[PDB]
Each structure stands twice: as structure tokens, then as C-alpha cells.
Amino acid sequence: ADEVQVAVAANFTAPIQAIAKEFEKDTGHRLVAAYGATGQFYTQIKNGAPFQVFLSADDSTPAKLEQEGEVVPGSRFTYAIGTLALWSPKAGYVDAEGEVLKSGSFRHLSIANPKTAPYGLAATQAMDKLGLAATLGPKLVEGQNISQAYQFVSSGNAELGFVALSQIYKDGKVATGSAWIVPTELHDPIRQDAVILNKGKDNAAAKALVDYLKGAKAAALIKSYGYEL
Ligand SMILES: [N+]
């Protein structure tokens, strides 16, 4: 039973580690994961990489690799859908329906740059749908990615941030601080897509992993880590 080398967006580290234990216990395939930012794997796969499967934190980068013939054509699918959360490390700062955001009664709001970060785009889409973009604009602090957006609500001076639910979840619930989980109607789906790389075209272990991700056991872990299927 061969191993499968997988490139995993760091957003998805904890779930793939849990999936890997079950995947190996149930199939004998050993899962060898590298973790990093989506763009780091994009540059590597373009330049030549050993992976047979790539789990992106977006859907545009797998699609670009397909357009470039660098991964198996037709292999792209959505393995997880991210969830956007309004979060503070302060207990009880964020009320259950997010009225703290909707009032505008706060000093700074941390977000990711929408041009490059899917969880940043979700935030700006939600603010636009609520009519809050212009009046909250002066309070925004923008980071390059969702990791920076989350860190700033902790080590920087923002009381609120639009973060990935997966950043604040443990064991199926928000682990610390306080959050408002943004309804799906307020933004486009935060699709996280996977592809099989040219190297994995005829690799049974690659196909087994990708289909395992589409199964019921994987779905249950994925939900508990803060995603939708
Ligand atoms: N929706």
C-alpha cells in the first residue's frame, strides 16, 4: 500500500492530520503532508514538485494550475467550504448575532485583503451586503492573509476581526473569546479546492485519498474543525 504525498494549505493542518490517522488505519496508505501557504505550493508545483494531491485554501489557484497543464485535467473539486466568523479574544465582547459589528461601536476591525484572501473577500462581501463598507471603512485594518487578520485581533490593537472559523474552533465549538458566525447568505462560498497533480494521475493512493475526502467519515471530521461540506 503506497504512500501519498499531499500539499496542504496551512489553514487545513489540523483536519488533515486527523484524517490522515483514519485514512492510514483504514486503507494502509501512509499520508505524507507538507503544510504551507497556497501561493507557496502554487510556485512550487509550477517549478516542479513531488506531490500527488494539492489541498488549496482557495479555488482559483487549483483552477489556474489546471489551466497551466501542471496538474491532472478535470480533477478539481471542493473538499471543504470555509466559514467566516466575527471574533474577539475578549469573552462576551461579541454578542450572539453580531450586533457589536452592526452598530459600529468599536475602534478597529481586522480583515484580510480581499484581492488575494478568500476569507477577506467573504468579509468585504458581507459588509457590502449589510451596507457597512463605507461607514466602517475608517476602522478597517487590512492584512495580507487570514493568518495576519487573526493575529492582529490578538497581538495588535483590533478588538474585532473577520477570521476563519477554523482558526478559532476546537472540538466543534469556538474555543476561546467570543464570535458571531456569519450566515452563508452574506457572501459567496469560501471554496477550498483540491486537485490531483500530474504525478498522481495513475496513482491509486492519490485517488483513494481524494475519494476518502468525499466520504462520510471525512465529512464528520471536517465539520468539527469549523467547515461546511
Ligand atoms: N447561502
Author numbering: 23 to 251
The authors write:
Acquisition of the trace-element molybdenum via the high-affinity ATP-binding cassette permease ModABC is essential for Pseudomonas aeruginosa respiration in anaerobic and microaerophilic environments.
Analysis of 485 Pseudomonas ModA sequences revealed conservation of the metal-binding residues and β-sheet structural elements, highlighting their contribution to protein structure and function.
